[PDB]
Amino acid sequence: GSHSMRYFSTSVSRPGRGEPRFIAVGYVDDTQFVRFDSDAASQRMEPRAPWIEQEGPEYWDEETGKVKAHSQTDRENLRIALRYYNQSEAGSHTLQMMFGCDVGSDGRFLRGYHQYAYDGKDYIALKEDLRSWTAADMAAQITKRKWEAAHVAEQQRAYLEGTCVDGLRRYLENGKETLQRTDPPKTHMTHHPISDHEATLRCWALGFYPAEITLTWQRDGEDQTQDTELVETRPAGDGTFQKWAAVVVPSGEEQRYTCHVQHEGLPKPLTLRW
Amino acid sequence: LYASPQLEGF
Amino acid sequence: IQRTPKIQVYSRHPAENGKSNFLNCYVSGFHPSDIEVDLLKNGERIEKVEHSDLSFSKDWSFYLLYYTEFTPTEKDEYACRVNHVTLSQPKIVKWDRDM
The missing domain is CATH 2.60.40.10 (Immunoglobulins)
Known part of the structure; x- marks a missing residue:
């Protein structure tokens, strides 16, 4: 049937105790297969399913690099949110991101996602057509303008229709026995x-x-x-x-x-x- | 596969 | 947003005295993510409890599974105790073989 690949990241600031904690997890349907924890000693993307351990060094180097870069991005994004809303630096705040794609029984694109949440509430989400954004409030509308100017929707569109679908197809095969049951x-x-x-x-x-x-x-x-x-x-x-x-x-x-x-x-x- | 890096934060 | 956690205490497999099982406490639908979860054996905190990697649902609310390997008996009683900013006091839920 139809499958999905999701990535969930959670950033939590901790004022007075250093940088915000960044935790990210990867899912194919209801099976988790990777995790990244900024507080961990490994500082690497880690396997959380057997069928992913077969991936070579290149994969684990690239994934690590990409998620660590997402770590820093959200880190700066929390500071920006603070500024936009003009909130106290004594308060802890949260920033969540979800992204991924849906395919069909033939493994071709069906749907894509790329959305943020600040303190539990929607902030900015890529629309179904993968060309426009929906900015929840006036702070998000400032991000929306900037992302429209920077052709951000075009970059994610390409990932959600290309890389995301391909990685998902690659996983559904390698994990045939597990994920396809x-x-x-x-x-x-x-x-x-x-x-x-x-x-x-x-x-x-x-x-x-x-x-x-x-x-x-x-x-x-x-x-x-x-x-x-x-x-x-x-x-x-x-x-x-x-x-x-x-x-x-x-x-x-x-x-x-x-x-x-x-x-x-x-x-x-x-x-x-x- | 993770989404490649993006800058242009909020 | 602030969202109260939902709490479920249960075993991985149908309970069988003398048979090794897994004690679970699933906490869901809460925000923010900071939360404390302990498993109690006859009122006493069980030590080496593991938990899944922090995740969340469509509505953005978080969920976590806390689990420890355990062997049920007829007289031992377990429970789950949760602390979260939305709770005025620790929320304790007793394990019941029929829920």
């Missing part, structure tokens, strides 16, 4: 009595990949939306994910409810009944 969820259902009159039915989804899934409840066939409790899909640690959905059923009516599971590891949606 789907683990169907193991599904079952648990029952938990609160009182004499009610009872909780819980629907489980275990050991699935990728993380995208959908758990729904139905009674007699209708959809139990505003009464279903849902948790965030969560990693198991082994590379698979977990999730559950629960509804509070009147005692003696447990057989009215069915659990519905949608995962791309499942040819067709499943239907669990208690």
Whole structure:
């Protein structure tokens, strides 16, 4: 199916304790494969998946260089943000960046990203057409003008349609066994009595990949939306994910409810009944 | 593959 | 922005007394990123807990997985304790074999 490669970087200033910490991670779909931590002793891009260890010296030198340069860039970008908003140098601030691309089953471009966030809020994001920017406020509008003049959108466009797609294609092959697989969820259902009159039915989804899934409840066939409790899909640690959905059923009516599971590891949606 | 360096900060 | 962390405590595999497992505490949807997470064995902080590399979601909110290898027993009780600027006090969540 369709795949993605994402890079997430986080810069956090620490006034009085030196330079801001820069941490970056790389993802292919839901599998992390690299990391960079400015505080680490290695000062190198490090492997975080087996299928990336095969890359030669050139790769690890170039990636390191590129991420370290992104480290310094965000470093200056935090100081600029400070100036724009005229904020105190006593306050800690955050700067996040995400970039990457989406491909299809044939491995050709489908979508691209290049966006920033300051203190948790959108700052500037490259639009879908990869030619224009959306500046969140008047501080970002100053960056937007400068980037339009410097043809920044053209540079990232080329990376997102060229290098990003190619690197992703290269990874999907090298990690064929890992990244190109789907683990169907193991599904079952648990029952938990609160009182004499009610009872909780819980629907489980275990050991699935990728993380995208959908758990729904139905009674007699209708959809139990505003009464279903849902948790965030969560990693198991082994590379698979977990999730559950629960509804509070009147005692003696447990057989009215069915659990519905949608995962791309499942040819067709499943239907669990208690 | 990481995006090549860019300057022209904010 | 300020966003309260979401907290989930659970084992990697279905719990089996005497069988080596992994104790997890997944914290998600919080901002800023500075956070403290400890795993408790009968109320006492477990020492060498590892955690994933800092990351975040579409909405920019952060998530982190804290994990330690452990062997469940019938009488030992675990939990996760979290400290974050949005919390007035440490948030403790007990491990339950059924959640």
